[PDB]
Amino acid sequence: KIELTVSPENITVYEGEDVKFTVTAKSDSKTTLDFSDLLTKYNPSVSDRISTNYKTNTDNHKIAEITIKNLKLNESQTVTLKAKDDSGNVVEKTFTITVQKKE
Amino acid sequence: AQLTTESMPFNVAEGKEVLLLVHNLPQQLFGYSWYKGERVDGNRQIVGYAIGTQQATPGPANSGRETIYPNASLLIQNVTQNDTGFYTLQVIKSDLVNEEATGQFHVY
């Protein structure tokens, strides 16, 4: 019933550089996303970092491009995203971000 | 119930306190950040507070008179001229649909 996918599955990026990815969750009955984990991990202090463009929002076909601004060196995690619908179905789909230096 | 921000007083004497009240804190909210001014600008953050972590981290605009409360209310103590003006509050939510909502107060 519920689909949930994350654009670049296992992301990697140089420190200072930003992270794009697009969460895509569709289903019959209203689907909403849960970035509880994404937020606690990458926005532990509340702040304007993380932009979230909902490209085709809709009731049932939620797609969102998230952009995590200026990754620091120690911000590598696997993060579990979630999608919930009305009937009461949950879906956890995990994905990894990993960061490095340039010199 | 669109997030509103009465300040008490509206017109604040120098050295007195003012308290920015917040009236419609949503549900499935991850935290609140106060900013100085009209727009939600990173450079101009006063403070954030995540409710889960229950931890408030001063931003670059903090002057150490603010005492943000878990109900999103601010309270600026011993105010002086440069405090005068607008103060956007943003409430970020589990689903990343956020809520800006600005208030004011003028110092004399």
Numbering used by the authors:
A (entry chain D): 7 to 109
B (entry chain A): 0 to 107
What wording appears in the published article?
We report here that surface‐expressed β protein of GBS binds to human CEACAM1 and CEACAM5 receptors. Human CEACAMs are a family of 12 cellular receptors belonging to the immunoglobulin (Ig) superfamily (IgSF) that are commonly expressed on epithelial cells, endothelial cells and leucocytes (Gray‐Owen & Blumberg, 2006). β protein is a multifunctional protein and interacts with several proteins of the human immune system, including factor H, Siglec‐5, Siglec‐7, Siglec‐14 and IgA, through distinct domains. A crystal structure of the complex showed that an IgSF domain in β represents a novel Ig‐fold subtype called IgI3, in which unique features allow binding to CEACAM1.
